[PDB]
């Protein structure tokens, strides 16, 4: 899932 | 246009956890397709293009355990999804490039 951290 | 199901939304954001910036940037996502952190998507629902706002998202709607995700968000753009975006279930870059997954 976003955001990509 | 307001953020809602099947809109492709572009946001600019800063993410803090325990007061420290962990991430910042701009992204586009297709709303209503479980493509974003759920608590953030919930905070975005109904927002107008141009709106700036803060959202606190608990871990249980999303980094240490049980920390709050503190977002500062700007809604940059809202538009309707193309038929291909709806079929793929995700947002696509502006330039048409027919494809599948
Ligand atoms: Ca700060
Ligand atoms: Ca999805
Ligand atoms: Ca505001
Ligand atoms: Ca617009
Ligand atoms: Cl997406
Ligand atoms: Ni695609």
Residue numbers in the entry:
A (entry chain B): 27 to 31
B (entry chain A): 1 to 62, 72 to 110
Original paper wording:
SlyD is a two-domain enzyme containing both a PPIase FK506-binding protein (FKBP) domain and an insert-in-flap (IF) chaperone domain. In order to improve our understanding of the mechanism of SlyD and of FKBPs in general, we set out to analyze the kinetics, energetics, and structural basis for substrate binding and inhibition of SlyD from Thermus thermophilus (TtSlyD) using 15-residue-long unmodified peptides, which we reasoned would be better mimics of natural unfolded protein substrates than the traditionally used 4-nitroanilide tetrapeptides.
Finally, we also analyzed binding of the S2, S3, and mutated variants of the S2 peptide to a chimeric TtSlyD construct, in which the IF domain is replaced by the flap loop from human FKBP12 (henceforth abbreviated TtSlyDΔIF). This peptide retained the ability to bind to both domains of TtSlyDFL, albeit with moderately reduced affinities. However, our results speak against such a scenario, because both type VIa1 and distorted VIb β-turns are observed in our TtSlyDFL:S2, TtSlyDFL:S2-W23A, and TtSlyDΔIF:S2-W23A structures, which strongly suggests that FKBPs can catalyze cis/trans isomerization of prolines present in (at least) both these two types of β-turns. The FKBP12 flap loop inserted into TtSlyDΔIF in place of the IF domain adopts essentially the same conformation as in full-length FKBP12 in the case of TtSlyDΔIF:FK506, while it is partially disordered in TtSlyDΔIF:S2-W23A and TtSlyDΔIF:S3.
